[PDB]
Amino acid sequence: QKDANFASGRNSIVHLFEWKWNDIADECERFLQPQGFGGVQISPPNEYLVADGRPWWERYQPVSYIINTRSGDESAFTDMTRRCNDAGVRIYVDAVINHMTGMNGVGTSGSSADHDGMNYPAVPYGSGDFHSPCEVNNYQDADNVRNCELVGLRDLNQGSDYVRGVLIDYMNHMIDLGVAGFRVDAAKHMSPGDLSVIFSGLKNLNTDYGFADGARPFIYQEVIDLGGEAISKNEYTGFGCVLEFQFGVSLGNAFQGGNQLKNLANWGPEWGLLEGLDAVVFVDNHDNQRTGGSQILTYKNPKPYKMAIAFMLAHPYGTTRIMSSFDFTDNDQGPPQDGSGNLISPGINDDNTCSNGYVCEHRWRQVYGMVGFRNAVEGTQVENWWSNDDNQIAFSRGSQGFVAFTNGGDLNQNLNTGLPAGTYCDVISGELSGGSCTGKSVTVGDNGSADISLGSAEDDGVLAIHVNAKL
Amino acid sequence: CIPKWNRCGPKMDGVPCCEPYTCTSDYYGNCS
Numbered sequence: 001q002k003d004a005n006f007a008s009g010r011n012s013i014v015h016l017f018e019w020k021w022n023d024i025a026d027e028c029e030r031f032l033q034p035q036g037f038g039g040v041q042i043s044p045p046n047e048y049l050v051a052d053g054r055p056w057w058e059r060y061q062p063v064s065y066i067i068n069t070r071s072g073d074e075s076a077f078t079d080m081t082r083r084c085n086d087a088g089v090r091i092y093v094d095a096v097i098n099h100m101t102g103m104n105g106v107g108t109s110g111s112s113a114d115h116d117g118m119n120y121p122a123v124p125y126g127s128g129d130f131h132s133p134c135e136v137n138n139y140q141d142a143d144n145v146r147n148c149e150l151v152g153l154r155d156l157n158q159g160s161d162y163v164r165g166v167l168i169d170y171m172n173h174m175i176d177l178g179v180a181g182f183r184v185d186a187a188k189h190m191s192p193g194d195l196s197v198i199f200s201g202l203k204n205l206n207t208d209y210g211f212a213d214g215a216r217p218f219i220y221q222e223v224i225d226l227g228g229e230a231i232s233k234n235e236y237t238g239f240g241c242v243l244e245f246q247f248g249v250s251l252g253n254a255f256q257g258g259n260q261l262k263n264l265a266n267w268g269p270e271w272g273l274l275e276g277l278d279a280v281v282f283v284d285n286h287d288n289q290r291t292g293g294s295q296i297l298t299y300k301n302p303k304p305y306k307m308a309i310a311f312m313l314a315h316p317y318g319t320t321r322i323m324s325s326f327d328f329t330d331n332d333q334g335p336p337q338d339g340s341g342n343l344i345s346p347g348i349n350d351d352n353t354c355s356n357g358y359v360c361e362h363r364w365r366q367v368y369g370m371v372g373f374r375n376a377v378e379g380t381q382v383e384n385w386w387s388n389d390d391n392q393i394a395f396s397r398g399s400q401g402f403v404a405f406t407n408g409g410d411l412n413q414n415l416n417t418g419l420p421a422g423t424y425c426d427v428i429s430g431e432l433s434g435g436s437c438t439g440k441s442v443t444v445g446d447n448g449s450a451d452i453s454l455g456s457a458e459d460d461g462v463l464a465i466h467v468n469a470k471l
Numbered sequence: 472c473i474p475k476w477n478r479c480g481p482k483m484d485g486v487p488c489c490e491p492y493t494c495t496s497d498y499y500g501n502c503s
Protein backbone atom coordinates (compact mmCIF):
# COMPACT_ATOMS: atom_id res chain seq x y z
CA GLN A 1 0.00 0.00 0.00
CA LYS A 2 2.96 2.34 0.58
CA ASP A 3 5.32 0.99 -2.08
CA ALA A 4 4.80 2.93 -5.32
CA ASN A 5 5.92 -0.16 -7.26
CA PHE A 6 8.17 1.95 -9.49
CA ALA A 7 10.58 0.18 -11.84
CA SER A 8 14.24 0.32 -10.81
CA GLY A 9 15.99 3.63 -11.32
CA ARG A 10 12.80 5.69 -11.65
CA ASN A 11 11.06 8.33 -9.56
CA SER A 12 8.06 10.67 -9.54
CA ILE A 13 4.45 10.41 -10.64
CA VAL A 14 3.26 12.89 -13.30
CA HIS A 15 -0.37 13.96 -13.25
CA LEU A 16 -1.21 14.06 -16.96
CA PHE A 17 -4.38 16.06 -16.25
CA GLU A 18 -7.09 15.36 -18.87
CA TRP A 19 -4.79 13.48 -21.23
CA LYS A 20 -6.18 10.74 -23.47
CA TRP A 21 -5.01 7.12 -23.13
CA ASN A 22 -3.39 7.03 -26.60
CA ASP A 23 -1.37 10.16 -25.88
CA ILE A 24 -0.21 8.90 -22.48
CA ALA A 25 0.87 5.64 -24.15
CA ASP A 26 3.01 7.67 -26.58
CA GLU A 27 4.36 9.89 -23.79
CA CYS A 28 5.47 6.82 -21.78
CA GLU A 29 7.77 5.62 -24.58
CA ARG A 30 9.03 8.86 -26.13
CA PHE A 31 9.64 10.92 -22.98
CA LEU A 32 8.76 9.50 -19.55
CA GLN A 33 10.90 6.36 -19.82
CA PRO A 34 13.94 8.08 -21.42
CA GLN A 35 13.86 10.79 -18.73
CA GLY A 36 13.53 8.34 -15.83
CA PHE A 37 9.97 9.04 -14.62
CA GLY A 38 8.22 6.42 -12.49
CA GLY A 39 4.53 6.79 -13.23
CA VAL A 40 1.45 8.64 -14.40
CA GLN A 41 -1.61 9.62 -12.41
CA ILE A 42 -4.49 9.58 -14.92
CA SER A 43 -7.81 11.45 -14.74
CA PRO A 44 -10.87 9.34 -13.72
CA PRO A 45 -11.27 6.52 -16.34
CA ASN A 46 -14.82 5.49 -15.35
CA GLU A 47 -17.99 6.89 -16.90
CA TYR A 48 -18.86 10.30 -15.49
CA LEU A 49 -21.44 13.04 -16.06
CA VAL A 50 -21.54 15.05 -19.27
CA ALA A 51 -21.88 18.51 -17.74
CA ASP A 52 -22.69 21.73 -19.60
CA GLY A 53 -19.57 23.35 -20.97
CA ARG A 54 -17.55 20.17 -20.37
CA PRO A 55 -15.69 21.57 -17.32
CA TRP A 56 -12.70 19.70 -15.88
CA TRP A 57 -14.77 18.79 -12.82
CA GLU A 58 -17.41 16.73 -14.65
CA ARG A 59 -14.92 13.86 -14.20
CA TYR A 60 -15.60 13.93 -10.48
CA GLN A 61 -19.28 13.01 -10.84
CA PRO A 62 -19.37 9.23 -11.58
CA VAL A 63 -22.32 7.75 -13.50
CA SER A 64 -20.98 4.15 -13.55
CA TYR A 65 -17.76 2.12 -13.63
CA ILE A 66 -17.70 1.43 -17.38
CA ILE A 67 -14.30 2.39 -18.76
CA ASN A 68 -15.38 4.87 -21.41
CA THR A 69 -14.70 8.61 -21.08
CA ARG A 70 -13.32 11.49 -23.16
CA SER A 71 -9.89 9.93 -22.59
CA GLY A 72 -10.92 6.77 -24.44
CA ASP A 73 -12.54 3.35 -24.10
CA GLU A 74 -11.30 0.16 -22.47
CA SER A 75 -9.32 -0.93 -25.53
CA ALA A 76 -7.38 2.34 -25.54
CA PHE A 77 -6.96 1.99 -21.78
CA THR A 78 -5.39 -1.48 -22.11
CA ASP A 79 -3.15 -0.32 -24.92
CA MET A 80 -1.95 2.42 -22.55
CA THR A 81 -1.28 0.10 -19.60
CA ARG A 82 0.48 -2.47 -21.81
CA ARG A 83 2.73 0.12 -23.46
CA CYS A 84 3.44 2.17 -20.34
CA ASN A 85 4.22 -0.92 -18.25
CA ASP A 86 6.48 -2.26 -21.02
CA ALA A 87 8.23 1.12 -20.86
CA GLY A 88 8.55 0.75 -17.08
CA VAL A 89 6.10 3.59 -16.36
CA ARG A 90 3.29 2.80 -13.90
CA ILE A 91 -0.33 3.91 -14.09
CA TYR A 92 -2.23 5.22 -11.06
CA VAL A 93 -6.02 5.50 -11.22
CA ASP A 94 -7.88 8.48 -9.77
CA ALA A 95 -10.57 6.53 -7.89
CA VAL A 96 -13.70 8.61 -7.28
CA ILE A 97 -15.62 6.39 -4.85
CA ASN A 98 -17.24 8.75 -2.34
CA HIS A 99 -20.16 9.82 -4.53
CA MET A 100 -22.03 9.86 -7.82
CA THR A 101 -23.68 12.97 -9.37
CA GLY A 102 -25.12 16.24 -8.07
CA MET A 103 -27.72 16.47 -10.83
CA ASN A 104 -29.56 14.47 -13.47
CA GLY A 105 -28.12 13.77 -16.90
CA VAL A 106 -26.23 11.20 -18.95
CA GLY A 107 -22.73 9.81 -18.69
CA THR A 108 -19.94 9.68 -21.25
CA SER A 109 -21.00 6.15 -22.18
CA GLY A 110 -24.69 6.98 -22.48
CA SER A 111 -25.73 5.63 -19.08
CA SER A 112 -28.51 7.42 -17.24
CA ALA A 113 -27.77 9.44 -14.12
CA ASP A 114 -30.80 10.05 -11.89
CA HIS A 115 -29.59 12.14 -8.96
CA ASP A 116 -33.17 12.97 -7.95
CA GLY A 117 -34.24 9.37 -7.45
CA MET A 118 -30.72 8.14 -6.62
CA ASN A 119 -30.76 5.70 -9.55
CA TYR A 120 -27.67 4.81 -11.54
CA PRO A 121 -28.90 1.88 -13.72
CA ALA A 122 -25.54 0.91 -15.20
CA VAL A 123 -24.05 -0.13 -11.85
CA PRO A 124 -26.77 -0.45 -10.55
CA TYR A 125 -27.23 1.81 -7.51
CA GLY A 126 -30.56 2.70 -5.92
CA SER A 127 -31.65 4.75 -2.90
CA GLY A 128 -30.61 2.08 -0.40
CA ASP A 129 -26.97 2.34 -1.48
CA PHE A 130 -26.66 5.97 -0.38
CA HIS A 131 -26.52 7.76 2.96
CA SER A 132 -29.69 9.62 3.87
CA PRO A 133 -29.37 13.13 2.47
CA CYS A 134 -27.82 15.97 4.49
CA GLU A 135 -25.03 18.35 3.49
CA VAL A 136 -21.40 18.59 4.54
CA ASN A 137 -21.24 21.89 6.41
CA ASN A 138 -19.41 21.32 9.69
CA TYR A 139 -15.79 20.19 9.56
CA GLN A 140 -15.65 19.99 13.35
CA ASP A 141 -18.05 17.04 13.09
CA ALA A 142 -16.44 13.93 11.57
CA ASP A 143 -19.83 12.26 11.03
CA ASN A 144 -21.17 15.26 9.09
CA VAL A 145 -18.06 15.36 6.89
CA ARG A 146 -18.23 11.65 6.04
CA ASN A 147 -21.92 10.74 5.94
CA CYS A 148 -23.43 13.78 4.26
CA GLU A 149 -23.41 15.03 0.68
CA LEU A 150 -20.31 16.86 -0.47
CA VAL A 151 -21.50 19.87 -2.52
CA GLY A 152 -24.74 18.14 -3.53
CA LEU A 153 -23.17 14.91 -4.81
CA ARG A 154 -25.11 11.78 -3.77
CA ASP A 155 -23.07 10.15 -1.01
CA LEU A 156 -22.41 6.41 -1.30
CA ASN A 157 -22.68 4.20 1.75
CA GLN A 158 -19.40 2.23 1.85
CA GLY A 159 -20.73 0.55 4.97
CA SER A 160 -23.05 -1.50 2.77
CA ASP A 161 -21.93 -4.96 1.67
CA TYR A 162 -23.37 -4.42 -1.80
CA VAL A 163 -21.54 -1.11 -2.26
CA ARG A 164 -18.22 -2.50 -0.98
CA GLY A 165 -18.58 -5.36 -3.44
CA VAL A 166 -19.19 -2.95 -6.33
CA LEU A 167 -16.19 -0.77 -5.40
CA ILE A 168 -13.88 -3.77 -4.87
CA ASP A 169 -14.95 -5.15 -8.27
CA TYR A 170 -14.23 -1.81 -9.98
CA MET A 171 -10.78 -1.49 -8.40
CA ASN A 172 -9.88 -5.15 -9.02
CA HIS A 173 -10.93 -4.70 -12.65
CA MET A 174 -8.36 -1.89 -12.89
CA ILE A 175 -5.71 -4.11 -11.25
CA ASP A 176 -6.46 -6.82 -13.85
CA LEU A 177 -5.80 -4.22 -16.54
CA GLY A 178 -2.32 -3.45 -15.19
CA VAL A 179 -2.64 -0.38 -12.93
CA ALA A 180 -0.13 -0.02 -10.08
CA GLY A 181 -2.25 1.83 -7.56
CA PHE A 182 -4.86 4.44 -6.77
CA ARG A 183 -5.19 8.11 -5.92
CA VAL A 184 -8.20 8.04 -3.59
CA ASP A 185 -10.41 11.07 -4.21
CA ALA A 186 -12.02 12.79 -1.19
CA ALA A 187 -10.70 10.19 1.28
CA LYS A 188 -11.47 12.56 4.17
CA HIS A 189 -15.14 12.23 3.25
CA MET A 190 -15.16 8.45 3.80
CA SER A 191 -14.69 6.33 6.92
CA PRO A 192 -11.27 4.66 7.45
CA GLY A 193 -13.11 1.60 8.76
CA ASP A 194 -14.81 1.11 5.41
CA LEU A 195 -11.71 1.98 3.40
CA SER A 196 -9.56 -0.60 5.20
CA VAL A 197 -12.08 -3.31 4.26
CA ILE A 198 -12.18 -2.19 0.62
CA PHE A 199 -8.40 -1.93 0.24
CA SER A 200 -7.94 -5.33 1.94
CA GLY A 201 -10.18 -6.94 -0.67
CA LEU A 202 -7.95 -5.76 -3.51
CA LYS A 203 -6.01 -8.48 -5.32
CA ASN A 204 -2.23 -8.42 -5.80
CA LEU A 205 -0.87 -6.66 -8.87
CA ASN A 206 -0.98 -8.45 -12.23
CA THR A 207 2.37 -10.10 -12.91
CA ASP A 208 1.52 -10.11 -16.64
CA TYR A 209 2.45 -6.42 -16.57
CA GLY A 210 5.87 -6.79 -14.97
CA PHE A 211 5.03 -6.62 -11.28
CA ALA A 212 6.72 -8.87 -8.74
CA ASP A 213 4.68 -11.66 -7.14
CA GLY A 214 2.96 -10.42 -4.00
CA ALA A 215 3.05 -6.77 -5.12
CA ARG A 216 0.28 -4.73 -3.50
CA PRO A 217 -1.51 -1.74 -5.07
CA PHE A 218 -0.10 1.65 -4.06
CA ILE A 219 -2.69 3.71 -2.17
CA TYR A 220 -2.37 7.49 -1.74
CA GLN A 221 -5.26 9.45 -0.29
CA GLU A 222 -6.54 13.01 -0.58
CA VAL A 223 -7.22 14.25 2.96
CA ILE A 224 -6.36 17.99 3.05
CA ASP A 225 -5.38 18.27 6.69
CA LEU A 226 -3.96 21.58 7.83
CA GLY A 227 -5.00 21.18 11.46
CA GLY A 228 -7.99 22.47 13.38
CA GLU A 229 -10.57 19.91 12.19
CA ALA A 230 -12.34 16.83 13.52
CA ILE A 231 -10.57 14.56 11.03
CA SER A 232 -6.83 13.95 10.92
CA LYS A 233 -4.50 12.61 8.21
CA ASN A 234 -3.13 10.17 10.80
CA GLU A 235 -6.38 8.20 10.64
CA TYR A 236 -5.54 7.07 7.09
CA THR A 237 -1.84 6.14 7.17
CA GLY A 238 -2.46 2.62 8.47
CA PHE A 239 -3.46 1.34 5.03
CA GLY A 240 -1.78 3.72 2.60
CA CYS A 241 -0.05 7.03 1.96
CA VAL A 242 -1.66 10.42 2.36
CA LEU A 243 -1.28 13.41 0.05
CA GLU A 244 0.59 15.88 2.27
CA PHE A 245 -1.15 19.20 1.60
CA GLN A 246 0.98 21.10 4.17
CA PHE A 247 4.09 20.51 2.00
CA GLY A 248 3.06 22.76 -0.89
CA VAL A 249 1.59 25.39 1.43
CA SER A 250 4.79 25.77 3.49
CA LEU A 251 7.10 25.61 0.45
CA GLY A 252 4.94 28.08 -1.47
CA ASN A 253 5.35 30.53 1.40
CA ALA A 254 9.10 29.99 1.88
CA PHE A 255 9.99 30.36 -1.79
CA GLN A 256 7.89 33.48 -2.11
CA GLY A 257 9.92 35.17 0.62
CA GLY A 258 7.56 34.51 3.52
CA ASN A 259 10.28 32.52 5.27
CA GLN A 260 14.08 32.49 5.03
CA LEU A 261 15.43 29.51 3.10
CA LYS A 262 18.00 28.80 5.84
CA ASN A 263 15.06 27.57 7.94
CA LEU A 264 14.54 24.60 5.62
CA ALA A 265 17.49 22.86 7.30
CA ASN A 266 15.10 20.78 9.44
CA TRP A 267 12.41 20.44 6.77
CA GLY A 268 10.27 17.38 7.45
CA PRO A 269 8.14 16.03 10.36
CA GLU A 270 9.49 18.79 12.63
CA TRP A 271 7.45 21.16 10.46
CA GLY A 272 4.31 19.17 11.21
CA LEU A 273 4.55 16.99 8.11
CA LEU A 274 3.73 13.29 8.00
CA GLU A 275 6.57 10.81 8.42
CA GLY A 276 8.24 10.61 4.98
CA LEU A 277 7.25 7.03 4.11
CA ASP A 278 3.57 7.93 4.57
CA ALA A 279 3.62 10.96 2.28
CA VAL A 280 3.13 11.83 -1.37
CA VAL A 281 4.26 15.42 -1.91
CA PHE A 282 3.70 18.03 -4.61
CA VAL A 283 4.06 21.80 -5.08
CA ASP A 284 0.62 22.26 -6.65
CA ASN A 285 -2.17 19.95 -7.76
CA HIS A 286 -5.07 20.17 -10.22
CA ASP A 287 -7.35 21.61 -7.54
CA ASN A 288 -5.27 24.22 -5.69
CA GLN A 289 -3.66 25.71 -8.82
CA ARG A 290 -7.11 27.28 -9.24
CA THR A 291 -7.01 29.65 -6.25
CA GLY A 292 -8.37 33.04 -5.31
CA GLY A 293 -5.02 33.88 -3.76
CA SER A 294 -1.30 33.42 -4.37
CA GLN A 295 -0.20 31.10 -1.57
CA ILE A 296 0.21 28.21 -4.00
CA LEU A 297 2.98 28.34 -6.59
CA THR A 298 1.91 27.42 -10.14
CA TYR A 299 3.17 27.60 -13.71
CA LYS A 300 1.99 31.24 -13.77
CA ASN A 301 4.80 32.22 -11.34
CA PRO A 302 7.65 30.27 -13.10
CA LYS A 303 10.78 31.25 -11.18
CA PRO A 304 9.85 30.41 -7.57
CA TYR A 305 7.66 27.54 -8.83
CA LYS A 306 10.65 25.83 -10.47
CA MET A 307 12.72 26.52 -7.32
CA ALA A 308 10.15 24.79 -5.09
CA ILE A 309 9.91 21.81 -7.49
CA ALA A 310 13.72 21.54 -7.56
CA PHE A 311 13.89 21.56 -3.76
CA MET A 312 11.20 18.85 -3.64
CA LEU A 313 13.10 16.63 -6.09
CA ALA A 314 16.50 17.20 -4.42
CA HIS A 315 15.27 16.50 -0.89
CA PRO A 316 14.78 12.88 0.24
CA TYR A 317 11.37 13.48 1.87
CA GLY A 318 8.43 11.50 0.44
CA THR A 319 7.19 10.23 -2.93
CA THR A 320 7.01 13.08 -5.42
CA ARG A 321 4.19 14.03 -7.78
CA ILE A 322 4.50 16.60 -10.56
CA MET A 323 1.54 18.49 -11.99
CA SER A 324 1.10 18.73 -15.78
CA SER A 325 -1.53 21.35 -16.63
CA PHE A 326 -3.53 22.75 -19.50
CA ASP A 327 -3.62 26.52 -19.95
CA PHE A 328 -6.56 28.24 -18.29
CA THR A 329 -7.87 31.72 -17.47
CA ASP A 330 -11.08 30.63 -15.72
CA ASN A 331 -11.43 28.12 -12.86
CA ASP A 332 -14.24 26.03 -14.39
CA GLN A 333 -12.67 25.97 -17.87
CA GLY A 334 -12.26 22.44 -19.22
CA PRO A 335 -9.32 21.05 -21.26
CA PRO A 336 -8.77 21.90 -25.00
CA GLN A 337 -11.71 20.52 -27.01
CA ASP A 338 -13.18 20.88 -30.51
CA GLY A 339 -16.66 21.92 -31.58
CA SER A 340 -18.07 18.47 -30.75
CA GLY A 341 -16.57 18.17 -27.27
CA ASN A 342 -13.72 15.83 -28.19
CA LEU A 343 -10.40 16.41 -26.44
CA ILE A 344 -7.60 17.97 -28.46
CA SER A 345 -4.33 16.04 -28.11
CA PRO A 346 -1.15 17.84 -26.94
CA GLY A 347 1.16 18.50 -29.88
CA ILE A 348 4.91 18.10 -29.40
CA ASN A 349 6.96 20.99 -30.79
CA ASP A 350 10.52 20.71 -32.13
CA ASP A 351 11.82 22.23 -28.87
CA ASN A 352 10.00 19.49 -26.90
CA THR A 353 7.32 21.87 -25.63
CA CYS A 354 3.61 21.26 -26.11
CA SER A 355 1.08 22.95 -28.36
CA ASN A 356 -2.72 22.90 -28.37
CA GLY A 357 -3.06 24.47 -24.92
CA TYR A 358 -1.01 22.24 -22.62
CA VAL A 359 1.61 23.61 -20.23
CA CYS A 360 3.57 20.35 -20.00
CA GLU A 361 5.57 21.27 -16.89
CA HIS A 362 7.07 17.77 -16.92
CA ARG A 363 8.80 18.63 -20.22
CA TRP A 364 10.52 21.71 -18.74
CA ARG A 365 14.30 21.18 -18.60
CA GLN A 366 14.42 22.34 -14.97
CA VAL A 367 11.77 19.75 -14.03
CA TYR A 368 12.91 16.62 -15.90
CA GLY A 369 16.51 17.59 -15.17
CA MET A 370 15.68 17.34 -11.46
CA VAL A 371 13.90 13.99 -11.93
CA GLY A 372 17.26 12.86 -13.36
CA PHE A 373 18.98 14.37 -10.32
CA ARG A 374 16.73 12.37 -7.96
CA ASN A 375 17.58 9.13 -9.77
CA ALA A 376 21.31 9.88 -9.58
CA VAL A 377 21.28 10.48 -5.81
CA GLU A 378 19.05 7.53 -4.87
CA GLY A 379 19.76 6.18 -1.40
CA THR A 380 21.79 9.13 -0.15
CA GLN A 381 21.05 11.64 2.60
CA VAL A 382 21.44 15.40 2.85
CA GLU A 383 25.02 16.39 3.64
CA ASN A 384 27.25 19.46 3.40
CA TRP A 385 24.35 21.79 4.29
CA TRP A 386 25.25 25.45 3.85
CA SER A 387 23.45 28.78 4.06
CA ASN A 388 24.43 32.44 4.26
CA ASP A 389 22.10 32.65 7.30
CA ASP A 390 19.46 34.22 5.05
CA ASN A 391 18.07 33.19 1.63
CA GLN A 392 20.98 31.29 0.11
CA ILE A 393 21.26 27.57 0.80
CA ALA A 394 23.11 24.60 -0.64
CA PHE A 395 23.50 20.92 0.19
CA SER A 396 24.64 17.69 -1.38
CA ARG A 397 22.95 14.32 -1.52
CA GLY A 398 25.73 11.99 -0.45
CA SER A 399 28.60 12.37 -2.92
CA GLN A 400 26.29 11.99 -5.91
CA GLY A 401 24.60 15.36 -6.35
CA PHE A 402 24.75 19.01 -5.26
CA VAL A 403 22.17 21.80 -5.41
CA ALA A 404 22.26 25.52 -4.58
CA PHE A 405 19.48 28.10 -4.24
CA THR A 406 19.21 31.85 -3.83
CA ASN A 407 16.08 33.84 -3.09
CA GLY A 408 18.01 36.95 -2.10
CA GLY A 409 21.27 38.37 -3.41
CA ASP A 410 23.88 36.87 -5.74
CA LEU A 411 25.37 33.54 -4.68
CA ASN A 412 29.13 33.47 -5.22
CA GLN A 413 30.77 31.01 -2.85
CA ASN A 414 33.46 28.36 -2.98
CA LEU A 415 31.45 25.54 -1.43
CA ASN A 416 32.11 21.90 -0.67
CA THR A 417 29.95 19.96 -3.12
CA GLY A 418 31.07 16.61 -1.76
CA LEU A 419 31.37 15.52 -5.40
CA PRO A 420 34.37 13.90 -7.11
CA ALA A 421 36.65 16.20 -9.13
CA GLY A 422 35.46 16.93 -12.64
CA THR A 423 33.34 19.23 -14.76
CA TYR A 424 29.60 18.98 -14.22
CA CYS A 425 26.77 20.29 -16.37
CA ASP A 426 24.16 22.34 -14.51
CA VAL A 427 20.93 20.44 -15.26
CA ILE A 428 18.78 23.52 -14.65
CA SER A 429 20.25 25.86 -17.27
CA GLY A 430 21.19 23.09 -19.68
CA GLU A 431 22.30 19.50 -19.90
CA LEU A 432 25.11 17.25 -21.13
CA SER A 433 25.05 17.18 -24.94
CA GLY A 434 27.56 16.38 -27.66
CA GLY A 435 30.21 16.04 -24.95
CA SER A 436 29.74 19.55 -23.62
CA CYS A 437 27.33 21.39 -21.33
CA THR A 438 24.63 23.29 -23.18
CA GLY A 439 24.22 25.57 -20.17
CA LYS A 440 26.38 26.41 -17.18
CA SER A 441 29.12 24.07 -15.98
CA VAL A 442 30.78 23.66 -12.58
CA THR A 443 34.36 22.53 -12.03
CA VAL A 444 34.82 20.50 -8.85
CA GLY A 445 38.32 20.33 -7.39
CA ASP A 446 40.27 17.41 -5.93
CA ASN A 447 38.76 18.20 -2.51
CA GLY A 448 35.15 18.40 -3.70
CA SER A 449 35.22 22.18 -3.41
CA ALA A 450 33.91 24.41 -6.20
CA ASP A 451 33.10 28.01 -7.12
CA ILE A 452 29.31 28.25 -7.22
CA SER A 453 27.91 31.26 -9.04
CA LEU A 454 24.21 32.05 -9.22
CA GLY A 455 22.99 35.58 -9.82
CA SER A 456 19.65 36.70 -8.45
CA ALA A 457 18.91 38.04 -11.94
CA GLU A 458 19.25 34.74 -13.78
CA ASP A 459 16.12 33.07 -15.21
CA ASP A 460 16.33 30.46 -12.44
CA GLY A 461 17.28 30.67 -8.78
CA VAL A 462 18.61 27.15 -8.56
CA LEU A 463 21.72 25.29 -9.73
CA ALA A 464 21.97 21.49 -9.65
CA ILE A 465 24.73 19.08 -10.65
CA HIS A 466 25.15 15.31 -10.26
CA VAL A 467 27.39 12.40 -11.26
CA ASN A 468 25.26 11.43 -14.28
CA ALA A 469 25.73 14.82 -15.96
CA LYS A 470 29.51 14.88 -15.62
CA LEU A 471 32.02 15.44 -18.44
CA CYS B 472 -18.91 26.58 6.91
CA ILE B 473 -16.17 25.07 4.75
CA PRO B 474 -12.57 25.62 5.98
CA LYS B 475 -9.82 26.76 3.60
CA TRP B 476 -8.77 24.48 0.71
CA ASN B 477 -11.81 22.24 1.11
CA ARG B 478 -14.49 21.45 -1.47
CA CYS B 479 -17.18 24.08 -2.10
CA GLY B 480 -19.95 24.85 -4.59
CA PRO B 481 -22.44 27.34 -3.04
CA LYS B 482 -24.93 27.17 -5.93
CA MET B 483 -25.37 23.46 -5.21
CA ASP B 484 -25.99 23.38 -1.46
CA GLY B 485 -25.77 26.94 -0.17
CA VAL B 486 -22.90 26.04 2.20
CA PRO B 487 -20.47 28.96 2.41
CA CYS B 488 -16.70 29.03 2.87
CA CYS B 489 -15.61 30.15 6.32
CA GLU B 490 -14.56 33.80 6.38
CA PRO B 491 -12.67 35.39 4.79
CA TYR B 492 -12.48 32.86 1.95
CA THR B 493 -14.67 32.42 -1.10
CA CYS B 494 -15.30 29.55 -3.46
CA THR B 495 -13.28 29.41 -6.67
CA SER B 496 -16.41 28.00 -8.36
CA ASP B 497 -20.19 28.14 -7.96
CA TYR B 498 -20.42 24.38 -8.43
CA TYR B 499 -17.14 22.61 -7.69
CA GLY B 500 -14.08 24.41 -6.39
CA ASN B 501 -12.11 25.11 -3.23
CA CYS B 502 -12.28 27.77 -0.53
CA SER B 503 -9.33 30.14 -0.89
Ligand SMILES: [Ca+2]
Pocket residue numbers: 098145146147148155156189190
Ligand atom coordinates in the same frame (compact mmCIF):
# COMPACT_ATOMS: atom_id res chain seq x y z
CA1 LIG C 1 -19.03 10.20 2.27
Ligand SMILES: [Cl-]
Pocket residue numbers: 222243285
Ligand atom coordinates in the same frame (compact mmCIF):
# COMPACT_ATOMS: atom_id res chain seq x y z
CL1 LIG D 1 -4.39 15.28 -4.89
